[PDB]
Amino acid sequence: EEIPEEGLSPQDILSAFDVEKCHFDYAIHPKELTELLKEVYGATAINAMQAEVIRWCQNLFHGSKEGYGLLTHGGTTSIIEAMAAYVIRARAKGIDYPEIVVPETAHAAFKKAAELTGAILITVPVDKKTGAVNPNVMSSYITRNTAVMVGSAPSFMNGIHDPISELGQLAKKKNVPFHVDACLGGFLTAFLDTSSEPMDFRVPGVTSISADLHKYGCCPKGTSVCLFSEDSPALSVYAALDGSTSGARVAEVYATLSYYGKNKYQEIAKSIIRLRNAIQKELTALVEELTSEDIYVYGNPQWSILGFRSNTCIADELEKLQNPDGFHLCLTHVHTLVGSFETQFIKDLREAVI
Amino acid sequence: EIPEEGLSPQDILSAFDVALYAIHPKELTELLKEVYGATALNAMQAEVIRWCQNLFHGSKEGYGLLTHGGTTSIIEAMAAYVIRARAKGIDYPEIVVPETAHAAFKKAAELTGAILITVPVDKKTGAVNPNVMSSYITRNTAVMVGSAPSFMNGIHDPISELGQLAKKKNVPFHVDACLGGFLTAFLDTSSEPMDFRVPGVTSISADLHKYGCCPKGTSVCLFSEDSPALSVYAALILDGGARVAEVYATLSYYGKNKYQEIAKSIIRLRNAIQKELTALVEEGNGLTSEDIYVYGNPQWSILGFRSNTCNAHFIADELEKWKLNLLQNPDGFHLCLTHVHTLVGSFETQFIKDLREAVIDVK
């Protein structure tokens, strides 16, 4: 209830949380990584590695090194960075009350940046059949005030991405910035074959991309990256933010991306998807017997997330989501390591509806 | 450009190769090392907050934040106050600060869409006059701030009286203590309190690196129960385990006794420097306080230097023979005392004979 008036011994301290050499007398990472991180940490509590880490990420999303990116405090923050800088230009452009144009399915970290930046959040409905925003419907929402439009790739709350390449078409035609939020799916897609439908800088007029390192980059929770194009009208503002620095947190990421390697990130991604298909087949299985209507997966997801909904009545009863009530399962490396994930949770997902 | 397949640790570490400063006891660097690997990949946080609240004399029912070092903690509260300002109907919210405040505030208002209102500060006291700042408060005022102290000079603002100026005009009052926060927390300030004891104070912000001695980049932002800012958090953190851990472990390892001991030693050292410097403009032939003086009556860990015959900058540059902090606008530099300046033997006798050599050349 108070700070120890007198220091506590190291044994009694880490006893709150020894298997250790020095004598003070969810998936868990390979001990030789858990500790590789330990000794990089002890040596940072450097300029080269941040600039390198970003330029890795700028290649992960097929960007060019005339753009600009930086690290932030993880998730919402890479979204404040972009949103902030975008309404800074909008104002410096001359716009008094700029808007943020997003789909309802967008991350809750947009109302906040709007309210933070003193901006207007314009929320555009998505196709209620596919869960993806209709670019034509979004067109009915862009005026001069628009500082930036947003596409989720995918969207946190259903695992359904917007069509980035079509939204990118509408972008230039209305000549506004087009932030792609990929905080969730960024580091799962950037190791998958998105090519017939890219969601990065391979889409013309996708000035900005936000991505979170932690979940699929497998870095500790507390870092992210926000990348800007060179046509990104936001450089205007930086050329004149949020975010504070800490050298170790670069190091923990530089050491982590390197230790995993590139096609280690790939095999987790492909395994998360195989599992996603897997869960779905064991689900529509039951409907070879419970019915479509009792429970279902919303839409045709492509990645790590499976949103579940139900028109009859399941989630915090499932101990074994936003306004359309539901719950999504966010699949992850650990879900791939648990033997037979699909035919447990689904035959304990029925054990929830009953 | 990301390694095509995993590197060996041996050649990740190889890339890592693995002015004054202190070193933690090996026992502690090695403690944090172990604590890291256990938490990198709980309600200690509530504990840290609860502790920090008590270090600044607040109820457990105020609301506190662990943030990312200084400006992040400052803009966090600034945003919240400006947001409720708009939530009320002030399209143009005002942030009232003394001009000695941090440029963090200038970011914050230039980010939140607020107007920064710089209040003049007393010219050779360094502290704001409450009577002056008083007509600097309108309806459109989102929040006012008092620094404790201001980083530039080591001079703090009359928080207890700024508090009176807050209770009557009914406007949120933020105490910026990102610097002196975890030095004053361990000193006897009951005479001139600069925290939640002062009625009217709605938020304090403080950093943990420089006197809390935590690793680089954690911070506390504390709101009281009477803080209007809570309602913002009630509707919606506005900016966003291991970081919880390195703070929890560091604060625990030290404890008050070590923190208070260091704190007062830093203060005696500040007096030491001042009075060894006053005792050199001593007698003839000669040097004086026109050529270099310490500005105002600093109380804490910072000493701002000036000169009215030479140039304070060619003075600070030419004692290559110290980590000093050259200061813009009124021309000068300050020394910020930390625990490490207390470990060396009689810091003040040798810094000053370096400081005389520094002025002899410059004159």
XYZ file of C-alpha atoms in Angstrom:
717
model
C 0.000 0.000 0.000
C 3.164 2.077 0.207
C 6.814 1.870 -0.922
C 9.079 -0.222 1.352
C 10.577 2.398 3.672
C 13.707 0.287 3.556
C 14.937 -1.775 0.600
C 13.795 -5.348 0.071
C 16.324 -8.078 -0.773
C 16.530 -9.399 -4.364
C 15.314 -12.830 -3.263
C 12.147 -11.426 -1.649
C 11.596 -9.155 -4.679
C 11.743 -11.705 -7.520
C 9.812 -13.970 -5.140
C 6.828 -11.753 -5.950
C 7.103 -12.944 -9.568
C 15.076 -18.119 -8.335
C 16.255 -20.659 -10.930
C 19.166 -18.339 -11.502
C 22.958 -18.464 -11.761
C 23.840 -15.288 -9.840
C 23.440 -15.819 -6.130
C 21.060 -13.228 -4.641
C 21.693 -14.768 -1.218
C 0.373 -18.530 -23.911
C 3.563 -19.677 -25.636
C 6.876 -19.395 -23.764
C 9.925 -18.601 -25.927
C 12.979 -20.863 -26.354
C 15.060 -20.295 -23.230
C 17.972 -19.194 -25.442
C 15.760 -16.376 -26.763
C 14.183 -15.468 -23.395
C 17.768 -14.895 -22.259
C 19.143 -13.485 -25.538
C 16.711 -10.754 -24.679
C 18.045 -10.739 -21.097
C 21.574 -9.720 -22.044
C 20.699 -7.229 -24.727
C 18.505 -5.714 -22.005
C 21.326 -5.576 -19.468
C 23.364 -3.675 -22.057
C 20.720 -1.022 -22.822
C 19.539 -0.166 -19.288
C 21.863 1.785 -31.106
C 20.978 4.409 -33.728
C 21.860 1.862 -36.417
C 19.303 -0.770 -35.405
C 16.154 1.422 -35.273
C 16.844 2.747 -38.764
C 17.467 -0.839 -39.875
C 14.392 -2.276 -38.069
C 12.140 0.266 -39.829
C 13.692 -0.371 -43.254
C 12.966 -4.062 -42.674
C 9.324 -3.178 -42.052
C 9.260 -0.859 -45.076
C 10.225 -3.911 -47.162
C 7.687 -6.088 -45.328
C 5.074 -3.817 -46.863
C 6.912 -3.107 -50.142
C 7.606 0.541 -49.389
C 10.383 2.752 -50.691
C 13.130 4.359 -48.628
C 12.001 7.841 -49.554
C 9.044 7.297 -47.246
C 9.253 7.614 -43.457
C 8.501 5.448 -40.420
C 9.021 5.212 -36.651
C 8.443 3.091 -33.544
C 5.732 3.809 -30.934
C 4.406 2.559 -27.718
C 2.374 -0.165 -29.226
C -0.877 -0.208 -31.054
C -3.081 2.642 -30.516
C -0.115 4.928 -30.612
C 0.982 4.243 -34.201
C -2.623 5.205 -34.939
C -2.397 8.442 -33.012
C 0.806 9.306 -34.871
C -0.803 8.998 -38.302
C -4.164 10.496 -37.300
C -2.432 13.337 -35.458
C -0.086 14.289 -38.303
C -2.973 14.042 -40.782
C -5.174 16.596 -39.023
C -2.090 18.748 -38.421
C -1.662 19.079 -42.191
C -5.419 19.403 -42.734
C -5.302 22.427 -40.433
C -2.047 23.746 -41.879
C -3.783 23.203 -45.224
C -6.459 25.535 -43.920
C -9.136 23.140 -42.684
C -10.819 24.191 -39.420
C -12.819 21.086 -38.442
C -11.197 18.057 -40.199
C -12.740 14.579 -40.149
C -11.463 11.048 -39.677
C -13.325 8.758 -42.092
C -13.518 5.147 -40.850
C -15.728 2.031 -41.099
C -17.709 1.045 -37.951
C -15.501 -2.028 -37.812
C -12.465 0.208 -37.340
C -10.339 0.026 -34.183
C -11.607 1.873 -31.076
C -8.335 3.789 -31.340
C -9.866 6.201 -33.849
C -12.564 7.964 -31.833
C -9.802 8.714 -29.346
C -7.403 10.209 -31.876
C -10.250 12.222 -33.302
C -11.169 13.502 -29.823
C -7.468 13.917 -28.964
C -6.625 15.806 -32.139
C -9.829 17.790 -31.841
C -11.180 16.196 -35.018
C -14.541 14.883 -36.243
C -14.931 11.095 -36.406
C -17.072 10.098 -39.374
C -18.156 6.443 -39.048
C -19.110 4.686 -42.293
C -21.176 1.475 -42.265
C -19.809 -1.715 -43.862
C -21.510 -4.361 -46.017
C -23.620 -6.333 -43.514
C -23.108 -9.488 -45.608
C -19.329 -9.454 -46.041
C -18.329 -7.177 -43.172
C -16.125 -5.136 -45.517
C -16.716 -1.413 -46.152
C -18.270 -0.515 -49.523
C -15.921 2.006 -51.204
C -18.909 3.605 -52.930
C -20.645 4.004 -49.566
C -17.427 5.590 -48.242
C -17.491 8.024 -51.167
C -20.783 9.294 -49.742
C -18.713 10.354 -46.726
C -15.693 12.239 -48.136
C -15.734 16.047 -48.490
C -12.977 18.680 -48.338
C -12.771 18.393 -44.538
C -11.461 14.807 -44.848
C -7.924 14.777 -43.437
C -7.628 11.013 -43.984
C -9.682 7.899 -44.832
C -8.963 4.543 -43.142
C -8.992 0.920 -44.272
C -8.520 -1.961 -41.837
C -6.403 -4.878 -43.047
C -7.980 -6.725 -41.523
C -10.505 -5.357 -38.991
C -9.922 -6.294 -35.308
C -13.514 -7.250 -34.497
C -14.355 -9.731 -37.289
C -11.104 -10.616 -39.043
C -12.355 -9.096 -42.287
C -10.209 -6.668 -44.326
C -11.495 -3.805 -46.452
C -10.665 -3.854 -50.147
C -7.472 -1.832 -49.933
C -6.789 -1.615 -53.653
C -10.267 -0.278 -54.450
C -10.260 2.085 -51.471
C -6.888 3.187 -52.854
C -8.573 3.945 -56.175
C -11.166 6.131 -54.452
C -8.289 7.677 -52.500
C -6.416 9.410 -55.316
C -9.627 10.270 -57.160
C -10.701 12.302 -54.117
C -7.005 13.073 -53.477
C -6.949 12.459 -49.712
C -4.590 10.448 -47.474
C -5.546 6.764 -47.027
C -4.204 5.269 -43.789
C -4.154 1.478 -43.758
C -4.517 0.166 -40.211
C -2.747 -3.181 -40.098
C -1.921 -3.133 -36.389
C -3.442 -6.585 -36.031
C -2.964 -8.409 -39.325
C 0.158 -6.551 -40.425
C 2.743 -9.074 -39.254
C 0.729 -12.108 -40.320
C -0.052 -10.827 -43.829
C 3.490 -9.492 -44.424
C 4.635 -13.129 -44.442
C 1.768 -14.405 -46.578
C 1.094 -14.314 -50.305
C -0.884 -11.099 -50.666
C -0.182 -10.278 -54.322
C -3.461 -10.602 -56.226
C -4.889 -8.393 -53.479
C -2.089 -6.367 -51.799
C -2.785 -4.169 -48.743
C 0.444 -2.168 -48.477
C 2.389 0.400 -50.508
C 1.923 -1.738 -53.635
C -1.478 -0.033 -53.644
C -1.038 3.478 -55.139
C -2.045 6.260 -52.742
C -1.792 4.270 -49.511
C 0.259 6.932 -47.830
C 0.237 5.436 -44.378
C 0.378 2.004 -42.721
C 0.262 1.223 -38.970
C 1.367 -2.189 -37.663
C 1.758 -3.765 -34.227
C 4.909 -5.827 -33.594
C 3.763 -7.887 -30.621
C 1.262 -10.561 -31.619
C 2.815 -11.824 -34.869
C 6.193 -10.096 -34.664
C 6.377 -11.958 -31.321
C 8.072 -8.980 -29.671
C 7.175 -8.061 -26.067
C 3.945 -6.075 -25.709
C 5.000 -2.450 -25.972
C 6.290 -1.634 -29.445
C 4.867 -0.914 -32.904
C 5.698 0.833 -36.167
C 3.989 3.586 -38.166
C 5.126 3.964 -41.777
C 4.493 6.922 -44.092
C 4.896 7.156 -47.862
C 6.845 9.823 -49.736
C 3.618 11.037 -51.313
C 2.327 10.939 -47.726
C 1.197 14.575 -47.226
C 1.982 14.082 -43.517
C 5.754 14.524 -43.919
C 4.741 18.196 -44.100
C 4.158 18.022 -40.340
C 7.309 16.108 -39.356
C 9.340 18.339 -41.675
C 8.414 21.276 -39.437
C 4.946 14.302 -31.921
C 3.478 11.738 -29.607
C 5.974 9.144 -28.660
C 8.981 9.064 -26.402
C 12.204 7.101 -26.733
C 13.912 4.200 -24.962
C 16.898 2.394 -26.513
C 16.290 -1.050 -25.019
C 12.917 -1.352 -26.704
C 14.538 -1.008 -30.112
C 17.057 -3.634 -29.058
C 14.423 -6.147 -27.881
C 12.779 -5.904 -31.310
C 15.983 -5.901 -33.373
C 17.073 -9.011 -31.500
C 13.629 -10.647 -31.825
C 12.887 -10.184 -35.549
C 16.425 -11.393 -36.225
C 16.200 -14.440 -33.952
C 12.929 -15.647 -35.434
C 13.988 -14.856 -38.988
C 11.710 -14.270 -41.970
C 10.349 -17.692 -42.990
C 9.873 -18.585 -39.332
C 7.340 -15.785 -39.311
C 5.971 -17.278 -42.545
C 5.407 -20.779 -41.155
C 3.501 -19.447 -38.140
C 1.314 -17.372 -40.460
C 0.472 -20.269 -42.784
C -0.118 -22.506 -39.751
C -2.491 -19.990 -38.160
C -4.498 -19.966 -41.433
C -4.524 -23.768 -41.827
C -5.893 -23.820 -38.281
C -8.469 -21.159 -39.196
C -9.800 -23.305 -42.042
C -9.570 -26.262 -39.634
C -11.762 -24.671 -36.945
C -14.343 -23.723 -39.577
C -14.638 -27.269 -40.958
C -15.121 -28.743 -37.471
C -17.790 -26.064 -37.001
C -19.909 -26.572 -40.126
C -19.345 -30.214 -39.256
C -21.741 -29.923 -36.358
C -24.328 -28.936 -38.970
C -24.048 -32.489 -40.308
C -25.789 -33.785 -37.197
C -27.259 -27.721 -33.802
C -27.947 -25.407 -36.731
C -26.592 -22.511 -38.817
C -28.607 -20.136 -36.663
C -27.473 -21.244 -33.236
C -23.962 -20.075 -33.983
C -21.925 -19.116 -37.045
C -18.669 -17.514 -38.168
C -19.362 -14.052 -39.619
C -18.298 -13.589 -43.252
C -15.437 -15.302 -45.094
C -12.362 -14.493 -42.924
C -8.868 -14.841 -44.395
C -6.506 -14.649 -41.446
C -6.173 -15.260 -37.721
C -9.557 -14.081 -36.468
C -12.893 -15.933 -36.334
C -15.810 -13.825 -35.135
C -18.779 -15.760 -33.812
C -22.399 -14.594 -33.722
C -25.777 -16.031 -32.838
C -29.375 -14.922 -33.389
C -30.935 -17.343 -30.886
C -29.087 -16.532 -27.675
C -21.644 -18.319 -25.068
C -18.315 -16.479 -24.656
C -17.581 -16.004 -20.937
C -19.400 -19.292 -20.466
C -16.732 -20.631 -22.850
C -14.111 -20.806 -20.116
C -13.079 -24.346 -20.893
C -17.121 -8.127 -29.014
C -18.733 -4.874 -30.071
C -22.230 -3.798 -30.803
C -23.372 -6.666 -32.939
C -22.684 -8.743 -29.898
C -20.238 -11.549 -30.486
C -16.855 -12.938 -29.671
C -13.934 -13.497 -31.952
C -11.134 -15.929 -31.383
C -7.772 -14.438 -32.258
C -5.573 -17.302 -33.417
C -1.891 -17.234 -32.550
C 1.364 -19.260 -32.647
C 0.403 -20.896 -29.317
C -2.904 -22.092 -30.816
C -0.763 -23.862 -33.436
C 1.385 -25.591 -30.808
C -1.578 -26.918 -28.782
C -2.183 -30.311 -30.328
C -5.573 -30.527 -32.016
C -6.906 -27.024 -31.260
C -9.923 -27.333 -33.558
C -11.642 -30.459 -32.162
C -11.664 -29.322 -28.595
C -12.767 -25.727 -28.696
C -15.464 -26.538 -31.222
C -16.564 -29.567 -29.134
C -16.452 -27.276 -26.158
C -18.051 -24.475 -28.153
C -21.130 -26.670 -28.477
C -20.622 -27.353 -24.789
C -21.312 -23.604 -24.501
C -24.509 -23.164 -26.541
C -26.150 -26.095 -24.736
C 16.270 -6.646 -45.089
C 14.992 -8.775 -42.200
C 17.276 -11.830 -41.714
C 16.050 -14.540 -44.068
C 16.221 -17.228 -41.417
C 16.987 -16.845 -37.697
C 20.339 -15.605 -36.697
C 22.184 -17.452 -34.000
C 22.119 -15.565 -30.757
C 25.858 -15.506 -30.843
C 25.810 -13.070 -33.796
C 22.843 -11.037 -32.582
C 24.747 -10.323 -29.358
C 27.849 -9.600 -31.479
C 25.947 -6.714 -33.073
C 25.274 -5.477 -29.553
C 28.980 -5.850 -28.695
C 27.864 -7.286 -25.340
C 30.202 12.917 -18.604
C 29.194 11.155 -15.359
C 26.921 8.237 -14.379
C 26.280 5.675 -11.625
C 26.054 1.889 -11.896
C 23.415 -0.097 -10.010
C 24.724 -2.628 -7.542
C 25.538 -5.714 -9.652
C 22.901 -7.426 -7.511
C 20.308 -5.041 -9.031
C 21.371 -4.966 -12.695
C 21.323 -8.725 -12.324
C 17.992 -8.533 -10.483
C 16.310 -6.533 -13.261
C 17.830 -8.872 -15.846
C 16.019 -11.819 -14.285
C 12.834 -9.843 -13.637
C 12.793 -8.865 -17.341
C 12.888 -12.416 -18.704
C 10.049 -13.341 -16.342
C 7.724 -10.561 -17.549
C 8.733 -9.551 -21.096
C 6.598 -12.105 -22.905
C 0.064 -8.031 -13.046
C -1.516 -5.870 -10.319
C 1.968 -4.712 -9.412
C 0.869 -1.862 -11.595
C -1.941 -1.010 -9.197
C 0.707 -1.223 -6.463
C 3.100 1.147 -8.291
C 0.220 3.588 -8.839
C -0.938 3.281 -5.205
C 2.625 3.915 -4.003
C 3.114 6.896 -6.314
C -0.244 8.295 -5.196
C 0.971 8.089 -1.578
C 4.346 9.631 -2.493
C 2.316 12.637 -3.637
C -0.258 12.381 -0.804
C -3.411 11.435 -2.745
C -6.326 9.128 -2.005
C -6.302 5.645 -3.521
C -9.388 6.843 -5.383
C -7.550 9.206 -7.664
C -6.614 7.661 -11.020
C -3.012 7.102 -12.073
C -1.022 6.150 -15.143
C 2.209 4.401 -15.982
C 3.407 6.206 -19.125
C 6.493 6.510 -21.312
C 8.691 9.207 -19.738
C 7.903 12.918 -19.384
C 6.237 14.518 -22.368
C 4.073 11.422 -22.816
C 2.873 11.863 -19.233
C 2.350 15.592 -19.799
C 0.399 15.435 -23.088
C -1.647 12.607 -21.563
C -3.226 14.931 -19.018
C -3.211 17.958 -21.313
C -5.229 15.961 -23.842
C -7.721 14.846 -21.198
C -8.303 18.373 -19.886
C -8.657 19.809 -23.403
C -11.035 16.975 -24.330
C -13.437 17.763 -21.445
C -13.073 21.405 -22.451
C -14.548 20.516 -25.848
C -16.984 18.065 -24.262
C -18.332 21.226 -22.511
C -18.490 23.622 -25.522
C -15.151 25.418 -25.697
C -14.150 24.876 -29.351
C -10.990 26.827 -28.533
C -9.624 25.485 -25.208
C -6.771 27.390 -23.527
C -3.766 25.890 -21.747
C -2.348 28.386 -19.243
C 1.370 27.861 -18.498
C 4.223 29.996 -17.119
C 6.780 30.637 -19.885
C 9.334 28.641 -17.889
C 7.277 25.507 -18.589
C 8.458 22.659 -20.856
C 8.123 22.659 -24.653
C 6.088 19.507 -24.032
C 3.117 21.764 -23.368
C 3.730 23.528 -26.680
C 3.496 20.145 -28.436
C 0.412 19.205 -26.428
C -1.675 22.262 -27.357
C -0.357 22.133 -30.939
C -1.580 18.519 -30.994
C -4.844 18.793 -29.051
C -5.904 21.856 -31.044
C -5.695 24.041 -27.932
C -4.169 27.534 -27.644
C -1.035 27.780 -25.471
C -1.243 30.798 -23.178
C 2.270 31.685 -21.933
C 2.133 33.601 -18.640
C 5.092 35.913 -17.931
C 7.235 34.837 -14.980
C 9.102 37.075 -12.474
C 12.372 38.225 -14.073
C 14.799 37.538 -11.235
C 12.806 35.194 -9.051
C 12.027 32.657 -11.764
C 8.631 31.919 -10.192
C 5.184 32.900 -11.538
C 3.042 35.513 -9.788
C -0.499 34.206 -9.100
C -1.838 37.768 -9.376
C -0.371 37.885 -12.897
C -1.599 34.479 -14.115
C -5.006 35.374 -12.632
C -6.276 37.480 -15.572
C -4.703 34.887 -17.865
C -7.634 32.622 -17.014
C -10.859 32.856 -19.012
C -13.880 30.612 -19.480
C -12.118 28.998 -22.419
C -9.363 27.862 -20.051
C -9.025 24.070 -20.117
C -6.293 23.814 -17.473
C -3.529 25.820 -15.782
C -0.128 24.424 -14.831
C 2.516 25.167 -12.243
C 5.938 23.548 -12.519
C 7.666 22.161 -9.413
C 10.260 23.056 -10.330
C 10.765 24.264 -13.903
C 13.606 22.381 -15.592
C 15.306 25.500 -16.820
C 16.269 27.155 -13.562
C 15.386 24.859 -10.693
C 12.886 27.465 -9.543
C 9.387 26.164 -8.723
C 6.015 27.902 -8.794
C 3.854 28.845 -5.817
C 1.753 25.699 -6.023
C 0.008 26.364 -2.698
C -1.075 29.817 -3.896
C -1.610 28.748 -7.502
C -3.913 26.273 -5.747
C -5.938 29.116 -4.236
C -6.096 30.613 -7.721
C -7.590 27.276 -8.858
C -10.187 26.685 -6.128
C -11.797 30.094 -6.734
C -11.756 30.187 -10.554
C -12.779 26.525 -10.545
C -10.350 25.352 -13.232
C -8.266 22.137 -13.312
C -4.744 22.677 -11.928
C -1.867 20.510 -13.167
C 1.437 20.271 -11.300
C 4.275 19.383 -13.698
C 6.799 17.532 -11.548
C 8.374 15.376 -14.268
C 11.733 16.606 -12.973
C 11.556 17.178 -9.218
C 8.736 14.707 -8.549
C 10.782 11.773 -7.271
C 13.219 14.023 -5.414
C 10.609 16.074 -3.540
C 8.620 12.903 -2.769
C 11.487 11.899 -0.478
C 12.107 15.301 1.103
C 10.209 17.159 3.825
C 7.917 19.487 1.870
C 5.088 19.707 4.425
C 5.829 23.429 4.820
C 5.539 24.200 1.103
C 3.646 21.203 -0.318
C 3.568 20.861 -4.109
C 1.231 17.858 -4.550
C -2.294 16.610 -3.779
C -2.181 18.068 -0.263
C -2.677 21.443 -1.953
C -6.461 21.618 -2.580
C -7.127 22.559 -6.197
C -4.425 20.382 -7.725
C -6.150 17.999 -10.144
C -3.133 16.258 -11.705
C 0.556 15.658 -11.016
C 2.941 14.218 -13.621
C 6.394 12.808 -12.802
C 9.250 10.845 -14.380
C 10.910 7.780 -12.826
C 14.281 7.604 -14.553
C 16.207 10.474 -13.058
C 15.438 10.138 -9.330
C 13.202 7.067 -9.174
C 16.272 5.532 -10.814
C 14.167 3.230 -13.019
C 15.354 2.387 -16.549
C 14.938 5.012 -19.282
C 11.315 5.732 -20.135
C 8.535 5.182 -17.594
C 6.395 7.908 -16.041
C 3.474 8.578 -13.718
C 0.419 10.721 -14.439
C -1.868 11.006 -11.419
C -5.361 12.495 -11.260
C -7.212 13.196 -7.986
C -10.822 12.264 -7.210
C -11.937 15.859 -7.731
C -10.274 15.856 -11.167
C -12.736 16.521 -14.044
C -10.364 14.615 -16.328
C -11.663 11.300 -14.919
C -14.957 11.767 -16.798
C -12.990 11.654 -20.068
C -11.518 8.272 -19.073
C -14.998 7.341 -17.916
C -16.322 7.756 -21.460
C -13.380 6.177 -23.295
C -6.010 4.715 -22.089
C -5.809 8.021 -24.065
C -2.221 7.368 -25.025
C -1.336 3.796 -24.116
C 4.231 -6.161 -17.672
C 7.990 -5.797 -18.070
C 7.831 -2.020 -17.690
C 5.544 -2.515 -14.696
C 8.190 -4.925 -13.451
C 11.376 -2.844 -13.834
C 9.648 -0.035 -11.942
C 8.249 -2.366 -9.264
C 11.601 -4.079 -8.804
C 13.648 -0.842 -8.830
C 11.390 1.059 -6.409
C 11.379 -1.945 -4.072
C 15.150 -2.539 -4.196
C 15.838 1.057 -3.214
C 13.004 1.835 -0.820
C 12.335 5.200 0.839
C 15.464 5.341 3.044
C 17.707 5.061 -0.003
C 15.550 7.470 -2.008
C 15.350 10.028 0.811
C 19.073 9.672 1.610
C 20.029 10.392 -1.983
C 17.481 13.208 -2.201
C 18.851 15.211 0.736
C 22.470 14.526 -0.274
C 21.666 16.076 -3.652
C 20.235 19.114 -1.851
C 23.276 19.588 0.429
C 25.421 19.361 -2.688
C 23.391 22.141 -4.337
C 24.108 24.401 -1.356
C 27.764 23.280 -1.435
C 28.221 24.423 -5.052
C 26.411 27.702 -4.365
C 28.473 28.651 -1.321
C 31.829 27.600 -2.743
C 30.900 29.801 -5.716
C 29.786 32.700 -3.533
C 33.082 32.067 -1.724
C 35.234 32.833 -4.756
C 33.672 36.161 -5.659
C 35.050 36.374 -2.099
C 37.865 38.943 -2.179
C 40.005 40.985 -4.551
C 41.940 40.959 -7.734
C 39.484 39.365 -8.267
C 36.272 37.802 -9.460
C 32.608 38.763 -9.108
C 28.970 37.680 -9.526
C 28.640 39.788 -12.688
C 30.953 37.378 -14.450
C 29.022 34.281 -13.336
C 26.104 33.933 -10.881
C 23.452 31.374 -9.931
C 19.975 32.583 -10.865
C 17.417 33.127 -8.115
C 17.066 30.971 -5.016
C 16.937 27.338 -6.291
C 15.738 24.724 -3.798
C 16.100 21.345 -5.408
C 18.571 19.706 -7.804
C 19.052 22.225 -10.639
C 21.454 25.209 -10.759
C 21.064 27.741 -13.566
C 24.079 29.882 -14.392
C 24.309 33.351 -15.962
C 26.868 36.069 -16.732
C 26.541 39.812 -17.320
C 30.084 40.449 -18.574
C 30.980 37.287 -20.457
C 28.928 34.791 -22.422
C 27.537 31.869 -20.414
C 27.773 29.628 -23.499
C 31.501 30.036 -24.298
C 31.818 29.352 -20.554
C 29.925 26.033 -20.528
C 31.508 24.861 -23.793
C 34.984 25.477 -22.394
C 34.819 23.292 -19.349
C 35.191 20.171 -21.480
C 37.633 19.452 -18.690
C 31.087 18.183 -17.490
C 27.671 17.081 -18.734
C 26.125 20.550 -18.731
C 22.871 21.708 -20.297
C 23.110 24.871 -22.417
C 19.804 26.861 -22.213
C 18.006 28.936 -24.908
C 16.550 32.441 -24.643
C 18.001 33.961 -21.482
C 21.565 32.846 -22.190
C 22.933 30.228 -19.913
C 23.201 26.599 -18.913
C 22.247 24.498 -15.925
C 23.741 21.611 -14.005
C 21.206 18.983 -12.976
C 22.354 17.146 -9.861
C 21.627 13.419 -9.570
C 22.715 10.566 -7.277
C 26.000 10.179 -9.189
C 27.179 13.726 -8.415
C 26.842 12.760 -4.734
C 29.077 9.674 -4.979
C 32.230 11.564 -6.017
C 34.241 13.273 -3.267
C 33.401 16.942 -2.646
C 31.882 17.621 -6.083
C 31.581 21.362 -5.467
C 35.268 22.134 -4.799
C 36.382 20.712 -8.127
C 33.428 21.675 -10.330
C 33.940 25.314 -9.318
C 37.717 25.471 -9.694
C 36.888 24.140 -13.139
C 34.261 26.891 -13.277
C 36.748 29.663 -12.495
C 39.171 28.328 -15.101
C 36.135 28.374 -17.379
C 35.512 32.085 -16.701
C 39.217 33.131 -16.642
C 39.586 31.993 -20.190
C 36.284 33.577 -21.331
C 36.864 36.937 -19.803
